[PDB]
Amino acid sequence: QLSARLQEAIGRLRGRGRITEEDLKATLREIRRALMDADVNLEVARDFVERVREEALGKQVLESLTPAEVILATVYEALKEALGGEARLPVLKDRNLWFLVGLQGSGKTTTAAKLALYYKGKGRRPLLVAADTQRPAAREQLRLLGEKVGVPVLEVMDGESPESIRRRVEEKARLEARDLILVDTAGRLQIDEPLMGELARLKEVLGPDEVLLVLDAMTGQEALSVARAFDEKVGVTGLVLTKLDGDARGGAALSARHVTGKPIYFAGVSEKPEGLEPFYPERLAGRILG
Amino acid sequence: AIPWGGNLEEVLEELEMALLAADVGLSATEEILQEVRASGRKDLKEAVKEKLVGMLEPPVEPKGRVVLVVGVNGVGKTTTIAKLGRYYQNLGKKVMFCAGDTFRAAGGTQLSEWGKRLSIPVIQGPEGTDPAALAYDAVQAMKARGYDLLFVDTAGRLHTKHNLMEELKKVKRAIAKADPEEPKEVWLVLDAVTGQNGLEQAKKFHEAVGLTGVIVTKLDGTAKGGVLIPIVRTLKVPIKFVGVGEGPDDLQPFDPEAFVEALLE
Ligand SMILES: Nc1nc2c(ncn2[C@@H]2O[C@H](COP(=O)(O)OP(=O)(O)CP(=O)(O)O)[C@@H](O)[C@H]2O)c(=O)[nH]1
Ligand SMILES: Nc1nc2c(ncn2[C@@H]2O[C@H](COP(=O)(O)OP(=O)(O)CP(=O)(O)O)[C@@H](O)[C@H]2O)c(=O)[nH]1
Ligand SMILES: O=C(O)N1CCNCC1
Ligand SMILES: O=C(O)N1CCNCC1
Ligand SMILES: [Mg+2]
Ligand SMILES: [Mg+2]
């Protein structure tokens, strides 16, 4: 079930006997190129195949009687591990406050409501916070999702200070015993210094225990710079990969995890609030390579 | 940066890196490099620019009165329509919008708020209303009231969802039922940060409703929008406008020379 280029790269070694390092090099070049065709950032794809090269050599690939299969298994296992190995979700505390952050259009508002529904069904009492005051009808959008999922939505006022947001959030959470606070932020470019500064100040005041970079699965090469900047300027604790019900390969997930070292917690698989499940590194590894 | 002036081998290696980093993709990158290697020219900077600018040509005047705006979830459709209204009202056109996104929460409201800010009328219906029936109504109002341009917003949809691509065909057919010449423009909106999936989006929207143009949004970001190169090469669809922000003025007619200059920076 591989992509055509990988099928050709691996397949042409089959039944041809033991390989030389020249054969390994030519194969790894094609693997690198396949990863780029799957939207893995070019630098991350290079680092990845360099790692694979040393692992395959260390597994004595040059003495293997089935080098095509050894290389393929090495790539798949390395990609699975590089994407996180196994599913992992955020550690719940008595009180949890998470930000959803990212680029314009990535899926943040929808994802906030999905997380609210997911965790309501696991005994939490969420509170949605509509902190996007710039996009027209942004607060109405989240209000309407909140109604759909049966979760309250505190709406931030135009011009409201982070300290006022904290005060109001703390009071509502205390009164109603809300223990998972999900803060939906406006989409922003990673190079928009004022808006990145605003987001960092909100984090400083609200003290989120997770800051989730919501990344569209169709994101290209810029995923590396985007994830790095959100991590350096704000601090990312994990990722949500959205719109995986499309056919984008999702290589950006590798770019983002490579530069942050942070887990991809969840996958978005529908427009519907029910369209969230844990991220399975194994599954995305197969999609990237397929 | 690409060392223009230096030796050929190092120019081509940084050019390759630059194109791939820009989301131009493997096939178009290789085509660009092969032609330049078989160029034999001392001013490589100008020869490369000329090849890329040639790949991207298959005030912007719509070919008719109705423009159907399509694209996947999140790309910038509704905002781009707002900007298009500002652009055309600045040229003296009588513009209206149809809030054809009757599916997503606050889709209609979002466009309605732009319409108020811009003094542009918006044809709207209740949530869940058939967008095809609404578009038909908007086209008959356009005709009866003598409007120059109608922009039809559509709900975000993934191109892998056959049923949603059919709904989009129904909207186009409804427009043509109201006015058999129309719509004379079907414009795909593509987010600049998109990788190689952009080409698949373009191919599938083109197969469904026949694109006459592409608008690339969010080019104020760091992404270069390079997947436009394989899109124009494959489908021969022209790039019409670029989005460069979140305000009503943040739209520019496509400028291939500047696009390519930015792509290589
Ligand atoms: N098919 C599908 N659509 C999704 C998924 N996640 C979000 N969407 C959709 O993508 C579009 C954008 O979602 P939205 O939640 O508004 O994104 P956002 O990042 O908050 C937009 P902004 O940056 O302006 O705040 C919506 O049409 C929505 O239904 C998903 O997992 N699958
Ligand atoms: N920085 C920047 N943001 C843009 C540009 N065009 C649109 N956006 C932004 O992207 C986000 C999504 O825009 P929107 O117009 O809602 O997109 P859409 O495709 O209609 C979303 P849906 O598919 O759900 O209907 C908004 O936050 C908006 O301000 C642009 O050129 N630059
Ligand atoms: O809710 C909290 O503040 N907690 C209690 C559970 N562990 C970490 C801190
Ligand atoms: O849960 C996951 O990680 N998925 C879901 C949909 N496809 C790719 C991976
Ligand atoms: Mg939002
Ligand atoms: Mg819209």
XYZ file of C-alpha atoms and ligand atoms in Angstrom:
639
model
C 0.000 0.000 0.000
C 2.965 2.371 -0.499
C 3.087 5.516 -2.619
C 4.248 4.831 -6.172
C 7.710 6.348 -5.650
C 8.411 4.312 -2.493
C 7.003 1.168 -4.165
C 9.482 1.716 -7.010
C 12.391 2.539 -4.638
C 11.870 -0.484 -2.339
C 10.541 -2.823 -5.019
C 13.538 -2.505 -7.339
C 15.779 -4.003 -4.628
C 13.595 -7.140 -4.265
C 15.152 -10.381 -5.527
C 18.380 -8.616 -6.555
C 20.628 -9.969 -3.834
C 22.526 -8.221 -1.095
C 22.939 -4.462 -1.556
C 25.881 -2.067 -1.514
C 26.003 1.256 0.270
C 25.464 2.851 -3.156
C 22.100 1.048 -3.386
C 21.258 2.183 0.167
C 22.107 5.787 -0.762
C 19.952 5.757 -3.916
C 17.040 4.242 -2.003
C 17.293 6.732 0.866
C 17.339 9.629 -1.645
C 13.986 8.392 -2.993
C 12.627 7.980 0.520
C 13.692 11.573 1.287
C 11.958 12.784 -1.858
C 8.787 10.777 -1.004
C 8.676 12.366 2.459
C 8.849 15.828 0.811
C 6.037 14.866 -1.589
C 4.109 14.034 1.610
C 4.765 17.598 2.962
C 7.551 16.713 5.391
C 9.741 19.821 5.574
C 12.900 19.324 3.477
C 15.332 19.734 6.418
C 13.328 17.384 8.634
C 13.149 14.810 5.795
C 16.935 14.995 5.459
C 17.500 14.493 9.224
C 15.024 11.619 9.131
C 16.716 9.676 6.344
C 20.134 10.299 7.929
C 18.760 8.631 11.080
C 17.310 5.768 9.008
C 20.675 5.314 7.261
C 22.539 4.842 10.522
C 19.830 2.530 11.922
C 19.745 0.374 8.778
C 23.575 0.128 8.731
C 23.532 -0.811 12.420
C 20.955 -3.531 11.677
C 23.492 -4.934 9.165
C 21.321 -4.060 6.149
C 24.355 -4.616 3.894
C 24.381 -8.320 4.917
C 20.595 -8.820 4.776
C 19.152 -11.253 2.226
C 15.944 -9.189 2.255
C 17.239 -5.585 2.165
C 14.076 -4.195 0.565
C 12.025 -5.420 3.536
C 14.616 -4.371 6.127
C 14.740 -0.822 4.728
C 10.945 -0.567 4.558
C 10.512 -1.862 8.112
C 13.241 0.497 9.357
C 11.538 3.516 7.713
C 8.094 2.605 9.025
C 9.317 1.936 12.584
C 11.417 5.140 12.622
C 8.516 7.231 11.315
C 6.097 5.715 13.872
C 8.541 6.475 16.674
C 9.294 9.991 15.360
C 5.530 10.735 15.388
C 5.315 9.633 19.050
C 5.289 5.838 18.992
C 1.888 5.323 20.665
C -1.215 7.341 21.488
C -0.945 9.677 24.440
C -3.470 12.195 25.803
C -2.951 15.191 28.127
C -2.539 14.473 31.843
C -5.649 15.645 33.667
C -5.365 17.571 36.955
C -8.040 18.831 39.373
C -7.998 22.078 37.341
C -6.973 22.176 33.649
C -6.720 25.264 31.462
C -5.678 24.794 27.839
C -5.144 27.240 24.949
C -5.932 26.439 21.292
C -3.527 28.397 19.120
C -2.365 28.476 15.499
C -2.685 29.949 12.056
C -5.814 31.451 10.553
C -8.225 28.717 9.478
C -6.484 25.722 11.075
C -9.516 24.463 13.062
C -9.114 25.968 16.542
C -12.687 26.974 17.373
C -14.075 23.638 16.180
C -11.357 21.811 18.073
C -12.142 23.656 21.317
C -15.749 22.428 21.077
C -14.639 18.881 20.165
C -12.361 18.773 23.225
C -15.236 20.041 25.376
C -17.513 17.245 24.138
C -14.804 14.577 24.407
C -13.957 15.423 28.013
C -17.569 16.034 29.108
C -18.111 12.370 28.198
C -15.178 11.444 30.479
C -16.514 13.129 33.589
C -15.085 16.638 33.215
C -17.045 19.858 33.413
C -15.635 22.079 30.657
C -15.893 25.808 30.135
C -15.312 27.275 26.691
C -13.673 30.736 26.491
C -14.198 32.736 23.275
C -11.111 34.930 23.317
C -11.117 35.780 19.565
C -12.456 39.374 19.429
C -11.174 40.256 15.919
C -12.825 37.780 13.484
C -16.440 38.768 12.698
C -18.925 36.438 14.399
C -16.107 34.490 16.149
C -17.732 34.603 19.572
C -21.146 33.693 18.125
C -19.524 30.754 16.367
C -18.183 29.350 19.656
C -21.391 30.211 21.535
C -23.362 28.173 18.975
C -20.942 25.202 19.238
C -21.170 25.373 23.027
C -24.969 25.159 22.855
C -24.631 22.138 20.552
C -22.242 20.299 22.921
C -23.967 21.357 26.173
C -21.034 23.383 27.524
C -21.051 27.047 28.709
C -19.106 29.736 26.837
C -17.636 32.789 28.529
C -17.118 35.468 25.919
C -14.258 37.942 26.153
C -15.171 41.610 25.607
C -13.485 43.891 23.059
C -10.418 45.482 24.672
C -10.603 43.304 27.795
C -7.317 42.873 29.695
C -5.832 39.423 30.378
C -6.242 40.120 34.101
C -9.984 40.789 33.633
C -10.310 37.577 31.605
C -8.616 35.664 34.431
C -10.879 37.185 37.101
C -14.072 36.342 35.195
C -12.879 32.878 34.200
C -11.830 32.076 37.755
C -15.184 33.231 39.175
C -17.323 31.307 36.696
C -15.167 28.181 37.080
C -15.383 28.360 40.877
C -19.154 28.967 41.009
C -20.072 26.267 38.528
C -17.215 23.903 39.440
C -15.772 23.871 35.899
C -12.515 21.936 35.821
C -11.454 22.065 32.134
C -11.124 25.532 30.694
C -10.620 25.687 26.932
C -9.431 29.028 25.592
C -10.062 29.550 21.880
C -7.679 32.205 20.461
C -7.740 34.073 17.171
C -5.772 32.759 14.226
C -2.469 34.605 13.853
C 0.667 34.473 11.755
C 3.788 33.252 13.579
C 5.588 36.430 12.373
C 2.922 38.870 13.617
C 4.932 40.176 16.556
C 2.177 42.193 18.295
C -0.281 39.288 18.128
C 2.324 36.730 19.183
C 3.194 39.049 22.079
C -0.500 39.275 23.024
C -0.761 35.490 23.064
C 2.389 35.170 25.220
C 0.981 37.720 27.718
C -2.314 35.814 27.941
C -0.328 32.640 28.702
C 1.676 34.437 31.379
C -1.481 35.637 33.119
C -3.777 32.608 32.670
C -1.071 29.979 33.232
C -2.354 27.226 30.923
C -1.057 23.728 31.604
C -1.389 22.945 27.878
C -0.923 25.151 24.829
C -2.133 23.163 21.844
C -0.927 24.117 18.393
C -3.811 23.267 16.075
C -2.239 22.290 12.759
C -4.115 21.652 9.508
C -3.074 18.310 7.983
C -2.677 20.001 4.579
C 0.021 22.359 5.926
C 3.140 22.415 3.768
C 6.855 23.111 4.274
C 6.228 26.150 6.481
C 4.967 23.850 9.273
C 8.558 23.776 10.601
C 8.918 27.546 10.962
C 5.337 27.901 12.234
C 5.693 25.322 14.978
C 9.150 26.616 15.967
C 7.926 30.221 16.279
C 4.808 29.293 18.282
C 7.056 27.186 20.521
C 9.775 29.846 21.001
C 7.482 32.893 21.319
C 4.674 31.291 23.373
C 5.513 27.705 24.323
C 3.686 24.724 22.815
C 2.900 21.599 24.918
C 1.232 19.537 22.227
C -0.542 19.436 18.886
C -3.880 18.663 17.340
C -3.847 17.618 13.711
C -7.082 18.571 11.969
C -8.903 17.721 8.744
C -7.447 14.215 8.523
C -10.728 13.194 6.828
C -9.164 14.835 3.764
C -6.406 13.124 1.779
C -3.442 15.361 2.664
C -0.638 12.991 3.708
C 0.075 14.966 6.884
C 3.855 15.294 6.772
C 3.571 18.629 8.637
C 2.921 16.569 11.777
C 6.502 15.251 11.519
C 7.874 18.740 10.904
C 6.082 20.031 14.001
C 7.013 17.172 16.289
C 10.632 17.203 15.128
C 11.165 20.865 16.053
C 9.104 20.940 19.300
C 9.537 17.414 20.644
C 5.898 17.659 21.763
C 3.142 15.045 21.443
C 0.402 15.143 18.849
C -2.465 14.394 21.232
C -5.508 14.325 18.965
C -6.742 13.963 15.379
C -9.646 15.857 13.814
C -11.585 13.547 11.511
C -14.844 15.473 10.862
C -16.444 18.945 10.954
C -18.743 17.541 13.688
C -17.976 18.000 17.405
C -17.822 14.210 17.668
C -15.005 14.151 15.067
C -12.076 13.819 17.460
C -10.042 10.810 18.484
C -6.592 10.179 19.887
C -3.706 10.550 17.455
C -2.199 7.156 16.461
C 1.400 7.609 15.270
C 1.196 4.205 13.578
C -1.737 5.285 11.420
C -0.203 8.551 10.252
C 3.101 6.802 9.528
C 1.198 4.504 7.151
C -0.615 7.394 5.491
C 2.595 9.378 4.987
C 4.270 6.360 3.360
C 1.196 5.194 1.376
C 19.860 33.033 -0.320
C 20.577 31.798 -3.853
C 24.102 32.948 -4.823
C 23.456 34.611 -8.199
C 26.845 35.402 -9.751
C 28.509 32.324 -8.238
C 29.205 28.986 -9.923
C 26.422 27.078 -11.726
C 26.500 23.999 -9.431
C 25.874 25.971 -6.204
C 23.233 28.207 -7.842
C 21.229 25.157 -8.895
C 21.497 23.512 -5.458
C 20.190 26.555 -3.584
C 17.568 27.055 -6.322
C 16.392 23.488 -5.787
C 16.229 24.054 -2.001
C 14.405 27.346 -2.518
C 11.759 25.813 -4.815
C 11.128 22.814 -2.567
C 10.969 25.030 0.548
C 8.379 27.095 -1.356
C 6.022 24.066 -1.839
C 6.630 23.967 -5.637
C 6.849 20.176 -5.352
C 9.138 17.504 -6.791
C 7.903 17.338 -10.395
C 7.748 21.065 -11.150
C 11.031 21.667 -9.317
C 12.796 19.042 -11.466
C 11.245 20.497 -14.641
C 12.443 23.994 -13.727
C 15.999 22.807 -13.007
C 16.291 20.624 -16.151
C 15.328 23.519 -18.440
C 17.770 25.891 -16.708
C 20.621 23.337 -16.951
C 19.848 23.183 -20.685
C 19.729 26.982 -20.935
C 23.376 28.003 -21.215
C 22.993 31.623 -20.110
C 25.193 33.959 -18.049
C 22.336 35.868 -16.376
C 20.825 32.867 -14.579
C 18.822 35.150 -12.253
C 16.837 36.580 -15.177
C 16.565 33.198 -16.957
C 15.086 31.500 -13.896
C 12.618 34.337 -13.280
C 11.508 34.048 -16.916
C 10.882 30.294 -16.721
C 8.779 30.610 -13.549
C 6.798 33.598 -14.818
C 6.064 31.573 -17.967
C 4.810 28.663 -15.866
C 2.324 31.032 -14.136
C 0.571 32.348 -17.271
C -1.676 29.711 -18.888
C -7.707 45.554 -13.110
C -9.217 42.073 -13.055
C -12.533 41.963 -14.918
C -14.913 39.058 -14.295
C -16.108 37.408 -17.487
C -19.743 37.858 -16.416
C -21.981 38.835 -13.534
C -21.824 35.797 -11.200
C -18.715 34.503 -9.397
C -18.979 31.173 -7.525
C -16.321 30.976 -4.805
C -15.218 27.460 -3.759
C -12.559 25.818 -1.613
C -11.830 23.563 1.326
C -12.590 24.353 4.961
C -10.658 27.288 6.442
C -8.922 28.659 3.303
C -10.369 32.197 3.293
C -13.510 32.113 1.074
C -15.827 34.361 3.081
C -13.145 36.999 3.822
C -12.003 36.940 0.185
C -15.566 37.688 -0.935
C -15.597 40.689 1.441
C -12.337 41.902 -0.131
C -13.699 41.310 -3.627
C -16.696 43.505 -2.784
C -14.394 46.284 -1.629
C -12.218 45.928 -4.733
C -15.141 46.090 -7.165
C -17.140 48.771 -5.329
C -13.965 50.885 -5.518
C -14.202 50.477 -9.325
C -17.808 51.691 -9.355
C -19.567 48.324 -9.601
C -22.846 47.594 -7.894
C -21.948 44.424 -5.934
C -24.005 41.940 -3.937
C -23.196 38.734 -2.010
C -25.075 35.488 -1.508
C -24.411 33.810 1.865
C -24.439 30.355 0.424
C -22.770 28.816 3.461
C -25.948 27.725 5.235
C -24.170 24.793 6.967
C -21.408 25.978 9.361
C -22.127 27.893 12.606
C -22.128 31.655 11.968
C -21.128 31.275 8.286
C -23.970 33.482 7.160
C -23.515 35.911 10.064
C -19.854 36.388 9.273
C -20.572 37.367 5.652
C -23.558 39.485 6.779
C -21.302 41.482 9.076
C -18.897 42.143 6.197
C -21.843 43.254 4.047
C -22.911 45.792 6.683
C -19.400 47.159 7.062
C -19.002 47.452 3.277
C -22.577 48.631 2.439
C -22.992 45.555 0.234
C -26.285 43.638 0.294
C -26.247 39.961 1.288
C -28.905 37.444 0.225
C -29.334 35.092 3.196
C -31.544 32.235 4.333
C -32.261 30.238 7.515
C -29.662 27.681 8.649
C -30.039 24.422 6.717
C -31.696 26.149 3.754
C -30.749 24.652 0.403
C -27.821 26.750 -0.894
C -28.818 25.980 -4.521
C -32.297 27.512 -4.028
C -30.709 30.517 -2.303
C -28.186 31.083 -5.137
C -30.993 30.875 -7.702
C -32.882 33.557 -5.717
C -29.809 35.765 -5.471
C -29.226 35.581 -9.234
C -32.873 36.543 -9.941
C -32.492 39.528 -7.541
C -29.218 40.481 -9.262
C -31.046 40.464 -12.619
C -34.205 42.266 -11.452
C -32.304 44.923 -9.496
C -29.580 45.477 -12.091
C -26.544 44.516 -10.015
C -23.189 44.255 -11.846
C -21.644 41.451 -9.769
C -22.897 38.707 -7.454
C -20.401 36.729 -5.371
C -21.708 33.387 -4.150
C -20.057 32.146 -0.943
C -20.040 28.365 -0.365
C -19.578 26.267 2.723
C -16.119 24.888 3.242
C -15.973 21.290 2.046
C -13.298 18.658 1.594
C -12.718 17.625 -1.995
C -12.728 13.945 -0.886
C -16.427 14.117 0.018
C -18.266 13.198 -3.174
C -21.675 14.202 -1.809
C -20.403 17.695 -1.000
C -18.881 18.098 -4.449
C -22.288 17.130 -5.880
C -23.970 19.830 -3.731
C -21.521 22.274 -5.255
C -22.504 21.106 -8.759
C -26.166 21.661 -7.769
C -25.379 25.252 -6.769
C -23.713 25.919 -10.133
C -26.635 24.353 -11.998
C -29.074 26.484 -9.991
C -27.163 29.603 -10.984
C -27.337 28.529 -14.657
C -31.085 27.778 -14.294
C -31.552 31.414 -13.241
C -29.173 32.747 -15.937
C -27.915 30.184 -18.522
C -24.756 32.205 -19.221
C -23.707 32.020 -15.566
C -21.632 31.604 -13.564
C -18.897 32.902 -15.875
C -16.321 32.742 -13.033
C -15.708 29.827 -10.659
C -12.806 30.771 -8.388
C -10.958 28.383 -6.102
C -9.539 29.820 -2.920
C -6.205 28.267 -1.857
C -4.433 28.955 1.460
C -0.732 29.821 0.721
C 0.532 27.573 3.530
C -0.935 24.497 1.786
C 1.488 21.877 0.499
C 1.061 19.401 -2.326
C -2.593 18.735 -1.388
C -3.289 22.097 -3.057
C -2.895 20.454 -6.459
C -5.342 17.685 -5.528
C -7.837 20.315 -4.289
C -7.546 22.240 -7.573
C -7.920 19.081 -9.680
C -11.058 17.935 -7.841
C -12.799 21.339 -7.686
C -11.944 21.757 -11.405
C -13.447 18.318 -12.222
C -16.624 19.190 -10.291
C -17.458 22.723 -11.427
C -14.718 23.920 -13.841
C -12.435 26.570 -12.380
C -11.724 29.782 -14.320
C -9.444 31.222 -11.646
C -7.565 30.781 -8.359
C -7.116 33.218 -5.457
C -4.253 32.549 -3.058
C -4.818 33.832 0.481
C -2.554 34.446 3.459
C 0.440 35.395 1.328
C 1.241 37.919 4.099
C 2.563 34.814 5.848
C 5.971 33.211 5.295
C 4.634 30.544 2.919
C 5.405 31.263 -0.729
C 2.316 29.609 -2.293
C 4.517 27.562 -4.611
C 1.945 24.811 -5.230
C 0.374 27.371 -7.574
C 3.131 26.497 -10.059
C 2.054 22.811 -10.555
C -1.602 23.950 -10.409
C -1.234 26.428 -13.288
C 0.985 23.970 -15.220
C -1.463 21.084 -14.832
C -4.842 22.800 -15.072
C -3.973 25.974 -17.000
C -6.132 28.004 -14.601
C -4.962 31.629 -14.095
C -4.173 33.189 -10.705
C -6.506 36.171 -10.257
C -5.778 37.747 -6.882
C -3.635 37.346 -3.759
C -4.847 37.864 -0.187
C -2.434 39.725 2.051
C -4.303 40.231 5.307
C -7.549 40.285 7.238
C -8.825 43.767 6.318
C -11.109 44.656 3.378
C -8.261 46.292 1.389
C -5.895 43.335 1.751
C -6.299 41.962 -1.780
C -4.092 42.532 -4.817
C -4.394 41.548 -8.470
C -1.908 38.733 -9.145
C 1.564 40.000 -10.175
C 3.655 37.118 -11.536
C 6.963 39.018 -11.530
C 6.629 39.987 -7.870
C 5.316 36.515 -6.971
C 8.409 34.841 -8.420
C 10.746 37.414 -6.865
C 9.215 36.628 -3.439
C 9.294 32.888 -4.082
C 13.089 32.948 -4.519
C 13.851 35.243 -1.528
N -13.723 18.177 7.617
C -13.194 18.763 8.694
N -13.406 20.089 8.863
C -12.836 20.708 10.026
C -12.088 19.964 10.995
N -11.705 20.853 11.931
C -12.213 22.075 11.568
N -12.901 21.972 10.413
C -13.547 22.990 9.617
O -12.589 23.897 9.086
C -13.145 25.223 9.000
C -12.369 26.143 9.932
O -12.668 25.787 11.298
P -12.604 26.810 12.534
O -12.848 26.054 13.787
O -13.431 28.019 12.271
O -11.060 27.225 12.482
P -10.308 28.418 13.227
O -8.862 28.029 13.245
O -10.968 28.675 14.521
C -10.577 29.864 12.165
P -9.808 31.358 12.853
O -8.324 31.245 12.717
O -10.374 32.517 12.090
O -10.230 31.462 14.268
C -14.571 25.118 9.482
O -15.284 25.054 8.216
C -14.723 23.774 10.156
O -15.962 23.111 10.136
C -11.934 18.534 10.686
O -11.283 17.816 11.471
N -12.479 18.022 9.579
N -3.523 36.662 7.477
C -4.520 36.436 6.598
N -5.658 35.844 7.050
C -6.713 35.642 6.086
C -6.594 35.994 4.706
N -7.768 35.643 4.127
C -8.547 35.082 5.103
N -7.893 35.098 6.278
C -8.331 34.612 7.575
O -8.437 33.186 7.643
C -9.476 32.814 8.531
C -10.543 32.048 7.755
O -11.190 32.944 6.848
P -12.678 32.693 6.304
O -12.948 33.818 5.353
O -13.588 32.455 7.440
O -12.435 31.331 5.529
P -13.503 30.276 4.957
O -12.822 29.486 3.880
O -14.740 31.031 4.620
C -13.858 29.257 6.378
P -15.148 28.063 6.021
O -14.541 27.049 5.081
O -15.396 27.471 7.374
O -16.332 28.795 5.460
C -10.069 34.103 9.042
O -9.427 34.264 10.308
C -9.542 35.239 8.220
O -9.420 36.520 8.809
C -5.311 36.633 4.361
O -5.102 36.976 3.174
N -4.366 36.803 5.319
O -5.477 20.990 39.782
C -4.329 21.201 40.122
O -3.984 22.485 40.221
N -3.501 20.203 40.469
C -3.968 19.056 41.235
C -3.558 17.798 40.488
N -2.142 17.807 40.200
C -1.456 19.022 39.786
C -2.048 20.325 40.331
O -6.202 9.153 14.682
C -5.356 9.339 13.798
O -4.148 9.729 14.159
N -5.660 9.396 12.494
C -7.050 9.654 12.147
C -7.353 9.844 10.676
N -6.297 9.537 9.768
C -4.912 9.664 10.105
C -4.550 9.390 11.543
Mg -11.593 30.435 15.414
Mg -16.746 30.759 4.949
